[PDB]
């Protein structure tokens, strides 16, 4: 596919991103009080470097529905002028402004 050659593309972007720091792993609940109870279903950027690495992401649009799943997750627990509020909000505009550009 040039879909998943796409994806790579984008996460390999998202990974090196100066506002990835909040995302690179999944959040360890034992540090952040109230995570577990709030976040039905947590998604971070090595998550989806392994599905891809092990090819589980049969269309560019599973890709695309973790990648929002990271950004929803965010808005959901960290308010929008929290330090990670504001990373996510600046990761979320730059996978939509490169989702568009190759879709
Ligand atoms: C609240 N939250 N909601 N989405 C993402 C985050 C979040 N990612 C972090 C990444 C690094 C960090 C910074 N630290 C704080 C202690 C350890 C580390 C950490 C590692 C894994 N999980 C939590 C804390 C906070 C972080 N807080």
């Known amino acids: 596919h040039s879909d998943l050659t796409f994806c790579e593309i984008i996460l390999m972007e998202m990974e090196s991103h100066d506002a990835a720091w ?21 998604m971070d950027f090595s998550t989806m470097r392994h599905r891809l690495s092990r090819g589980g992401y049969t269309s560019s649009e599973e890709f695309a529905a973790d990648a929002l799943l ?10 929008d002028d929290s330090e990670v509020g504001k990373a996510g909000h600046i990761m979320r505009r730059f996978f939509e ?4 550009e190759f879709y």
């Open 70 to 79: 990271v950004f929803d997750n965010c808005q959901t627990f960290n308010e």
């Open 22 to 42: 909040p995302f690179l792993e999944p959040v360890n609940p034992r540090l952040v009080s109230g995570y577990r109870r709030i976040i039905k279903n947590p």
């Open 97 to 100: 402004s490169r989702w568009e």
